[PDB]
Design a protein around this ligand. Structure first.
Ligand SMILES: CCCCCCCCCCCCCCCCCC(=O)OC[C@H](COP(=O)([O-])OCC(O)COP(=O)([O-])OC[C@@H](COC(=O)CCCCCCCCCCCCCCCCC)OC(=O)CCCCCCCCCCCCCCCCC)OC(=O)CCCCCCCCCCCCCCCCC
Ligand SMILES: CCCCCCCCCCCCCCCCCC(=O)O[C@@H](COC(=O)CCCCCCCCCCCCCCC)COP(=O)(O)OCC[N+](C)(C)C
Ligand SMILES: CCCCCCCCCCCCCCCCCC(=O)O[C@@H](COC(=O)CCCCCCCCCCCCCCC)COP(=O)(O)OCC[N+](C)(C)C
Ligand SMILES: CCCCCCCCCCCCCCCCCC(=O)O[C@@H](COC(=O)CCCCCCCCCCCCCCC)COP(=O)(O)OCC[N+](C)(C)C
Ligand SMILES: CCCCCCCCCCCCCCCCCCCC(=O)O[C@H](COC(=O)CCCCCCCCCCCCCC)COP(=O)(O)OCCN
Ligand SMILES: CCCCCCCCCCCCCCCCCCCC(=O)O[C@H](COC(=O)CCCCCCCCCCCCCC)COP(=O)(O)OCCN
Ligand SMILES: CCCCCCCCCCCCCCCCCCCC(=O)O[C@H](COC(=O)CCCCCCCCCCCCCC)COP(=O)(O)OCCN
Ligand SMILES: CCCCCCCCCCCCCCCCCCCC(=O)O[C@H](COC(=O)CCCCCCCCCCCCCC)COP(=O)(O)OCCN
Lengths: 127, 111, 438, 155, 83, 536, 77
């Protein structure tokens, strides 16, 4: 039965309240909770922050291993066995404008250097 | 033990002598708790428990004065960049010591 | 203009001749008639007259009154919100005090003379000292705070006005004068620094709001905080622009610090009126900084956001006053289950709290967009700083709403017919401004 | 450029004559001037009549600029919606004009602290062009991107 | 690149605009993608069964173009001495 | 005609939420579904006109919504091919959920207010999708945020539910703050808020980072995924809408509408989110939480595909619209299962006589999730996986994510149907009316139509890959499914515990960020304004 | 007058007793830890500031080096 279920009422305060009792959220039902669960009190699974940090320390190298190879170790010539899509000159010139384009990696092109410098563009507006 | 005070007809009279307690606006007032009242009193009068300690000075400086210093530095940097952007001469700001009198750009002038 | 001034003078006049049992009815009729006179002033204000819509003088420089964009908006706002204050307040003494306060404040907005502005605005100094320090429900400490803060800031402003009157020969706004002195600029600035609550001169506003009556709080939040922007557009920016541009990094430092620390101080509140009062302080900083940029966007955005605040914060204060009448408590921890116990009050409370969080269908959204655009015109980082730390407001508003929303309660505390009549105009105005009729 | 007191007083007298000429005939558009009062004053506040008149002229001009920018945006949107996938080629000119109108409207009265509005990234593009020219002629290596033909839909 | 020259572009600019072909699809295969597009939007729900010849032809020409791209890659790589 | 659907949804919201006293519980149970059915006809007309027949329309309701100096914005609706597709999907799912809530929410006090929230919730989604300028999108964005706040916290007497709503509100606030920054950047340097003049070929990185940070909020990516799992506190109809279409998809829709994203960031973030979501869904024991983590993983796939190719935006949208269907079906069937068993934990579910329709819908939705061949989900997911081969780092992580997805999907299916009965010997029952059958029929019709009509134009376009590379995702999914059926142990107890805690993102926030937040509050108030600056 | 301080024990047998209490001291983070975490998180918040600072310094340094090389070229020539 969704409606009308019995509930336990939280006991009324009977002792001097701590100054930071606003960290406790109590609506009158018995299981009151911290303002943010895990800030204090019982920990889910009895796992501290140190345990989670050690687990992440174990995971990150394995997760980052696929990404680091292509992004850093690999180079445009050796990343893929083919060149980017070849377009007619009118289409290619427009597509090369996009900083987030995919034709900027065409090392066959004679404008490769300028295209690469376009890809690594400005961090912030100059004006 | 209770009676209806309000009368929509307009014939309302307050029965101050009535044996039955009127259902007036005080009927719905929250009962209140002694310790909650003392917590409210403590929290409002928290200046009584203020003590100058090196930890207190450290906290006040590092957060309040630190945020003021950071904001002032960022604002000064933005003003410098805007002066370079607009083409204005370096402006004589209050605490900047500049040997230029440029403060307000002339609208008529082309910069 | 002349009709508006005459009606403003007529309202305190009527109280002397009324029967003392007809006082409430006569005061309400006078307030509505002043609102209608303000609408007439808007009607007779042609946009073709770009500098000043209307100027009237009654024989001296002090008696020079005029309306501009900012003045017209603020005067219509005060005339709109006064009747709600009138109905909320009972007794000849209270009616007299509130009528005199409103007459002085509304005459200050349209004044074009710095000395007359000072004279009218500070005439309401004891009236708040008596009002906030009333017998049973008032606190003397808060009245002392507000009175002393106002006196020192207004005296500095007065000294600057005296220097301007000595040097130029005039202190009227209509006569073009410019000064580069920093002492006079600070003398005018300190009033704005105190009146618009800006850290660290914001301590008076909280104590005043909590210990003022609901009508008093409504007026204080609605228009007395906005008097700072009338002074800034009318009596500081025209003459003291060189100093605001010289001190802009300092101005930004103080404004953004006020925003951040007021937001953080709001998180430590257990009293509903204090929560709303601190939200007001955080809201004032964007207005002050947007005007200080001295750009077309900034001035318009600041006056718009003042209108949005003067429609949203009076509603929150009114709702809190209604809840306190029903419950005799303002502590959030005592108040639970308000959603089930007061569905009609809860709906309006949530609506106005969404307005205070600047959600799109509310005027605060449009006003904030314009102000942030002005800040972005000055620099990108300026807008980014304000946009991020707006999340602090969400935390405390959400915590308050969650604490009030649910729980166990044995009291039906919902608003009566009088209460709903009290907020209906504010809700309608909020909606109308939110859809773009700013 | 120096202003003697005699010339200043003469201009004051001439401005009084202008005010008298305006007062003779009623005008409902008095505060919406079509022409400014030309002057060589150091500060326009010196002569109050010129100050307010030219301020009204500037306000009128800015209102016209705002409405003009809205117009340009409307034709830009229509041209975008008409051509389809050919928008980038055929709407280059209209976007150019619209962005020019935006810069005019913003920059004429930006204010004391406000920066220039770079619609279309033209000033940045020019800065990059100058930097590249200097780096190439002086033999330096530029750490900044070279100038782009098109950075936005127009400019 | 020079050894493996671009093919002739059958589709013209007015035809590509009339078919509303995005610039990304204009890759020497545009005529076949015009055929595939018109047939796909002609048959909203049976295009998978009906529109198979056009898709096949587009995929064939794309395969040839991909072979050209790989040939260009090999030529450039051997020119640089990497192989 | 185009305006009509938003009118119908907002009318349903106003009618049920303001005049529900007159209408009644039955009155909602008619006016809601009828209005959304009419909106479904209107959305179908829109989809045929715009997508199939290539006819975009612009409706300007009124001009100068904000007119301050140069800053000028108008309330206008542009139905472009993206908008029509999202509108159709959203209205279809919302009509289904409104049919569902008639019987599910009958045991709830405020069914009229729930229907009103659901209808305004859909209406704000359609405002976001069809806006022609950035401000209308922001309006819809904040509307869906507030509607999620009012729907997750529907049970106000539960501290967990209201805290979940507060979590959602705060995280979404940070995200739209970043978006508002990007909006201001784009207005300043392009001259307008409209998407047509919004186009920039080169954009500075700050704008891209701000756009991405804003998008990762609603489309819950890593460091912003905390709210999605807690969003389970709300009623089941809320979860279906938020996870299927309205909230999660909005970030992807924004990233596709404006191609200002950077390839390097999106691919890494998406692949990380997909792997982490699958790993988290491995440990979960609530039925509803596993499906949320699967939603996270699918969002990771969609975000990753943007980096791969030019067609990545089309592929992401196709997976978006395909995902809405079977995910909504999975939530609705899970909610019915909870009602029938009075339980939320997977251990105590088991084989029991039931309706053939619901079990079939669960099976087919889970098969679409797994990647079963010749299904709508299969094509939209292979389009991503096969085209991600060029990005070696992304492809590997997505393939492991496919394995994990298969494993927990098959585990959930075995635990719900194949496993022996695990609940107690008590009278528990939820009899399903014809309205719920019409709901699941609508979902099944969406799934079936997706196969015939497809998701993207380049869905069946060849990716020139070797056969063993192209058919690899099927083998990984099959291996994951077979391992899931056997219920084998994949990780050690330490890593299983780590995944059960969802990586400890929330515990870090608790112990460091929240404590620093309230210490800043302590310094600001207690030490300074009520301390140093307060008289005795 | 005041609310009763006596609790209700009707539901203790169903839902457990209230004897078990919280172990929290209701105290905040130490000053030293707070300094570290403020001065770490706040910079992360202000990531645009450092990007603008970096690019502005790069622009000014390149401009100055160009000016120096220009002076060198314009001195001899
Ligand atoms: C930012 C950095 C962080 C800030 C804190 C860092 C540590 C602060 C160090 C200073 C300190 O310890 O203060 C404690 C000390 C108070 O002593 P106490 O131990 O708290 O108790 C003694 C009382 O009995 C206390 O009894 P009480 O409880 O009854 O009195 C309480 C009183 C006690 O308060 C006071 O007495 C003074 C309050 C204002 C102090 C002025 C600034 C001092 C700190 C700023 C610089 C700090 C950098 C280090 O507080 C008030 O109620 C008054 C405040 C209301 C007005 C608010 C105006 C604010 C102005 C600036 C705010 C301070 C900056 C923080 C926010 C920044 C915002 C931009 O304050 C001072 O002594 C003031 C020192 C500096 C005064 C300024 C120089 C005076 C000029 C004299 C010129 C001589 C003229 C010669 C002619 C003479 C013939 C006429
Ligand atoms: C206790 C309350 C119970 C009663 C509930 C009342 C229910 C209210 C119904 C909601 C109304 C929604 C209508 C929103 C449109 C706003 C109406 C409007 O602004 O009127 C416009 C006219 O425009 C319209 O009529 C719009 C048509 C409304 C119907 C269109 C389809 C309805 C779908 C709703 C989608 C609206 C999204 C808009 C987001 C901003 C005025 O035209 P102008 O002369 O140009 O005014 C100047 C512009 N400005 C206001 C900014 C100064
Ligand atoms: C865009 C153009 C068209 C605009 C139409 C908007 C759609 C409807 C707008 C109606 C007015 C919006 C503001 C309504 C009042 C806000 C309060 C509210 O919505 O709900 C109230 C009460 O609701 C009402 O009585 C009135 C609601 C009527 C319809 C509300 C539709 C949803 C609101 C739309 C969100 C506003 C958008 C603002 C940001 C863009 C409180 O609800 P709860 O806190 O959840 O508690 C209820 C009890 N229980 C615990 C059991 C759940
Ligand atoms: C590094 C940050 C990078 C990512 C940033 C996104 C997330 C930032 C932190 C998210 C906090 C928002 C979550 C929230 O609302 O917290 C409380 C709401 O309570 C609070 O109000 C606590 C305040 C926290 C909000 C601010 C703290 C984090 C601030 C970030 C940086 C601090 C200072 C930075 C400069 C101001 C609710 O959490 P739960 O107790 O778990 O409820 C979930 C449901 N269930 C019960 C089932 C578990
Ligand atoms: C896939 C993309 C990446 C996903 C997220 C990866 C996050 C990786 C960050 C964790 C890995 C490096 C951790 C630093 C090394 C610490 C190793 C020992 C931990 C330790 O001794 O102290 C801990 C400090 O917390 C800490 O260690 C907090 C440091 C965390 C840095 C902030 C990065 C955001 C982390 C969000 C998720 C990570 C959750 C787990 C960290 C516990 O402190 P204590 O409570 O015992 O102190 C006592 C209270 N007086
Ligand atoms: C007794 C009370 C005081 C005691 C405690 C004070 C301790 C605080 C000291 C550190 C405060 C933060 C660091 C800011 C000051 C750095 C030193 C000032 C010198 C300076 O301006 O250098 C600029 C610093 O970068 C900058 O422009 C600022 C970068 C740091 C701001 C962002 C980090 C926090 C972000 C949080 C938001 C706050 C800002 C919101 C807008 C860069 O040099 P330059 O190139 O500009 O040339 C200007 C020639 N000196
Ligand atoms: C060449 C000269 C060199 C400089 C020499 C400086 C010498 C000192 C000058 C200080 C002048 C400031 C005057 C204000 C004094 C503070 C208020 C007095 C404190 C006080 O106890 O007042 C109580 C309440 O006041 C309150 O509750 C008000 C709280 C504090 C008011 C805040 C002060 C106003 C804002 C301060 C700065 C504003 C901007 C400054 C430009 C009422 O006391 P009682 O009536 O019961 O009498 C019983 C006697 N114990
Ligand atoms: C420490 C941070 C500053 C706090 C202020 C924060 C922001 C306020 C800015 C308000 C904007 C307009 C105000 C004009 C200037 C006020 C203060 C500006 C900063 C300042 O003190 O600059 C001083 C110059 O101003 C002066 O010489 C006069 C200073 C103000 C006097 C204080 C009390 C005046 C009261 C007069 C009442 C009315 C009198 C009317 C006759 C010294 O800077 P510098 O240029 O010498 O550079 C030397 C550095 N190496």
């Amino acid at each position: 039965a969704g409606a009308g279920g019995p509930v336990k009422l939280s006991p009324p305060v009977d002792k001097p309240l701590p100054y930071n009792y606003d960290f406790w959220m109590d609506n009158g039902i018995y299981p009151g909770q911290p303002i943010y669960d895990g800030m204090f009190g019982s920990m889910v699974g009895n796992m501290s922050l140190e345990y989670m940090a050690k687990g992440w320390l174990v995971l990150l190298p394995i997760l980052s291993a696929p990404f680091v190879y292509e992004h850093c170790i690999a180079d445009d010539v050796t990343r893929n066995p083919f060149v980017p899509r070849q377009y007619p000159s009118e289409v290619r010139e427009f597509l090369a404008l996009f900083k987030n384009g995919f034709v900027l990696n065409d090392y066959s092109q004679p404008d490769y250097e300028e295209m690469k410098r376009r890809q690594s563009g400005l961090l912030t507006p100059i004006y | 033990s209770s009676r209806i005070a309000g009368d929509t007809t307009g014939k309302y009279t307050p029965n101050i002598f009535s044996p039955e307690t009127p259902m007036d606006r005080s009927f719905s007032h929250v009962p209140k708790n002694p310790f909650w009242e003392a917590w409210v009193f403590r929290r409002d009068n928290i200046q009584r428990e203020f003590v100058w300690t090196w930890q207190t000075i450290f906290d006040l400086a590092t957060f309040v004065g630190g945020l003021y210093v950071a904001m002032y530095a960022t604002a000064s940097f933005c003003s410098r960049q805007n002066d370079k952007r607009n083409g204005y001469p370096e402006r004589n700001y209050y605490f900047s010591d500049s040997k230029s009198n440029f403060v307000i750009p002339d609208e008529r002038e082309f910069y | 203009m002349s009709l508006y001034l005459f009606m403003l003078f007529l309202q305190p006049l009527s109280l002397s001749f009324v029967s003392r049992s007809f006082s409430k009815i006569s005061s309400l009729m006078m307030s509505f008639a002043t609102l209608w006179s303000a609408v007439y002033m808007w009607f007779t204000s042609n946009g073709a007259n770009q500098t000043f819509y209307q100027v009237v003088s009654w024989g001296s420089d002090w008696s020079t009154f005029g309306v501009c964009y900012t003045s017209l908006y603020i005067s219509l706002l005060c005339a709109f919100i006064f009747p709600i204050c009138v109905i909320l307040v009972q007794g000849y003494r209270a009616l007299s005090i509130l009528i005199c306060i409103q007459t002085a404040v509304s005459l200050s907005i349209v004044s074009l003379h710095m000395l007359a502005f000072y004279a009218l605005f500070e005439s309401s100094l004891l009236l708040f000292f008596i009002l906030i320090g009333r017998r049973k429900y008032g606190s003397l400490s808060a009245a002392y705070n507000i009175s002393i803060y106002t006196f020192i800031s207004a005296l500095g402003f007065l000294i600057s006005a005296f220097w301007l009157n000595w040097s130029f020969g005039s202190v009227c706004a209509l006569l073009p004068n410019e000064e580069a002195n920093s002492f006079v600029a600070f003398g005018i600035f300190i009033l704005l620094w105190v009146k618009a609550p800006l850290v660290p001169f914001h301590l008076w506003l909280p104590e005043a709001h909590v210990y003022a009556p609901t009508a008093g709080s409504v007026l204080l939040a609605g228009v007395l905080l906005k008097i700072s922007i009338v002074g800034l557009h009318v009596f500081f920016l025209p003459i003291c622009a060189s100093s605001i541009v010289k001190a802009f990094p300092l101005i930004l430092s103080i404004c953004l610090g006020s925003f951040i620390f007021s937001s953080f101080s709001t998180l430590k509140q257990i009293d509903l009126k204090k929560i709303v009062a601190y939200s007001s302080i955080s809201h004032m900083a964007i207005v002050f900084l947007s005007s200080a940029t001295n750009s077309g966007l900034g001035i318009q955005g600041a006056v718009l956001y003042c209108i949005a605040h003067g429609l949203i914060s009076p509603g929150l204060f009114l709702l809190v006053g209604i809840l306190y009448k029903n419950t005799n408590t303002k502590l959030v921890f005592y108040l639970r289950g308000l959603s089930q116990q007061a569905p009609v009050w809860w709906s309006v409370w949530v609506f106005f709290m969404l307005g205070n969080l600047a959600f799109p269908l509310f005027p605060n959204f449009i006003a904030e967009v314009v102000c942030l655009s002005a800040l972005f015109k000055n620099h990108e980082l300026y807008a980014y700083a304000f946009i991020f730390f707006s999340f602090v407001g969400t935390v405390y508003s959400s915590t308050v709403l969650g604490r009030l929303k649910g729980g166990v309660s044995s009291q039906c505390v919902d608003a009566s017919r009088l209460d709903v009549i009290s907020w209906n105009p504010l809700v309608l105005a909020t909606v109308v401004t939110g859809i773009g009729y700013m | 450029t120096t202003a003697t007191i005699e010339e200043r007083r003469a201009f004051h007298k001439e401005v009084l004559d202008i005010v008298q000429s305006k007062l003779a005939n009623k005008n409902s558009e008095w505060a919406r001037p079509e022409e400014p009062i030309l002057h060589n004053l150091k500060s326009e506040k010196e002569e109050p009549h010129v100050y307010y008149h030219n301020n009204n002229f500037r306000v009128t001009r800015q209102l016209i600029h705002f409405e003009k920018t809205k117009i340009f945006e409307d034709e830009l949107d229509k041209c975008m919606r008409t051509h389809g996938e050919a928008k980038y080629r055929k709407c280059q000119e209209i976007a150019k004009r619209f962005q020019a109108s935006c810069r005019v409207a913003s920059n004429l009265e930006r204010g004391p602290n406000a920066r220039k509005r770079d619609v279309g990234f033209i000033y940045q593009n020019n800065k990059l062009r100058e930097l590249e020219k200097d780096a190439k002629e002086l033999g330096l290596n530029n750490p900044f991107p070279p100038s782009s033909p098109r950075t936005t839909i127009g400019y | 690149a020079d050894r493996f020259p671009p093919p002739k572009m059958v589709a013209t600019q007015e035809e590509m605009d009339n078919a509303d072909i995005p610039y990304k699809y204009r890759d020497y295969c545009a005529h076949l993608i015009i055929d595939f597009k018109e047939c796909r939007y002609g048959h909203p729900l049976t295009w998978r069964i009906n529109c198979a010849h056009e898709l096949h032809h587009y995929n064939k020409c794309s395969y040839i173009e991909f072979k050209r791209r790989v040939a260009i890659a090999i030529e450039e790589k051997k020119r640089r001495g990497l192989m | 005609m185009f305006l009509l659907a938003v009118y119908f949804l907002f009318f349903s919201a106003i009618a049920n939420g303001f005049f529900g006293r007159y209408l009644g519980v039955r009155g909602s149970q008619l006016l809601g579904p009828s209005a959304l059915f009419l909106a479904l006809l209107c959305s179908g007309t829109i989809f045929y006109e715009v997508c199939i027949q290539g006819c975009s329309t612009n409706i300007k309701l009124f001009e100068n919504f904000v007119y301050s100096n140069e800053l000028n914005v108008s309330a206008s609706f542009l139905y472009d091919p993206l908008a029509a597709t999202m509108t159709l999907t959203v209205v279809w799912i919302s009509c289904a959920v409104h049919a569902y809530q008639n019987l599910y929410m009958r045991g709830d006090g405020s069914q009229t207010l729930f229907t009103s929230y659901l209808s305004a919730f859909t209406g704000f989604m359609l405002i976001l999708v069809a806006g022609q300028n950035l401000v209308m999108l922001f309006i819809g964005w904040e509307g869906i945020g507030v509607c999620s706040y009012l729907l997750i916290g529907y049970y106000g007497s539960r501290v967990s539910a209201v805290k979940s709503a507060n979590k959602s509100l705060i995280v979404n606030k940070i995200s739209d703050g970043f978006l508002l920054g990007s909006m201001l950047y784009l207005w300043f340097y392009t001259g307008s808020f409209s998407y047509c003049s919004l186009a920039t070929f080169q954009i500075p990185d700050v704008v891209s980072i701000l756009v991405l940070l804003g998008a990762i909020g609603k489309s819950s990516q890593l460091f912003f995924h905390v709210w999605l799992a807690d969003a389970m506190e709300g009623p089941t109809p809320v979860s279906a809408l938020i996870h299927a279409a309205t909230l999660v998809t909005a970030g992807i829709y924004v990233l596709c509408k404006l191609n200002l994203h950077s390839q390097s960031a999106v691919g890494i973030l998406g692949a990380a989110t997909a792997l982490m979501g699958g790993l988290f869904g491995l440990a979960a024991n609530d039925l509803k939480r596993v499906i949320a983590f699967s939603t996270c993983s699918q969002l990771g796939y969609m975000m990753a595909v943007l980096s791969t190719c030019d067609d990545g935006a089309d592929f992401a949208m196709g997976h978006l619209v395909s995902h809405a269907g079977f995910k909504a079906t999975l939530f609705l069937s899970a909610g019915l299962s909870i009602a029938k068993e009075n339980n939320n934990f997977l251990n105590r579910y088991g084989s029991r006589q039931g309706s053939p329709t619901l079990s079939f819908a669960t099976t087919i939705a889970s098969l679409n999730l797994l990647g079963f061949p010749e299904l709508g989900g299969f094509y939209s997911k292979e389009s991503i996986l096969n085209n991600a081969y060029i990005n070696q780092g992304v492809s590997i992580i997505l393939t492991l994510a496919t394995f994990l997805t298969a494993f927990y999907t098959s585990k959930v299916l075995a635990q719900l149907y194949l496993f022996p009965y695990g609940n107690g010997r008590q009278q528990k029952s939820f009899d399903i009316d014809a309205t719920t059958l019409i709901c699941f029929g609508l979902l099944l019709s969406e799934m079936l139509l997706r196969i015939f009509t497809g998701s993207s134009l380049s869905q069946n376009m060849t990716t020139n890959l070797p056969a063993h590379i192209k058919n690899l995702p099927f083998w990984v999914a099959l291996s994951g499914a077979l391992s899931g059926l056997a219920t084998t142990n994949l990780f050690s107890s330490n890593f299983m515990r780590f995944f059960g805690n969802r990586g400890g993102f929330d515990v870090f926030y608790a112990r460091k960020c929240s404590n620093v937040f309230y210490h800043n509050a302590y310094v600001s108030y207690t030490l300074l304004d009520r301390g140093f600056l307060k008289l005795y | 007058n005041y609310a009763s301080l006596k609790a209700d024990t009707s539901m203790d047998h169903v839902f457990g007793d209230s004897t078990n209490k919280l172990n929290y001291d209701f105290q905040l983070m130490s000053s030293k830890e707070a300094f570290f975490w403020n001065y770490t998180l706040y910079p992360i918040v202000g990531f645009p500031i450092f990007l603008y600072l970096y690019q502005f310094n790069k622009l000014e340094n390149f401009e100055a080096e160009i000016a120096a090389a220009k002076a060198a070229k314009a001195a001899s020539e």
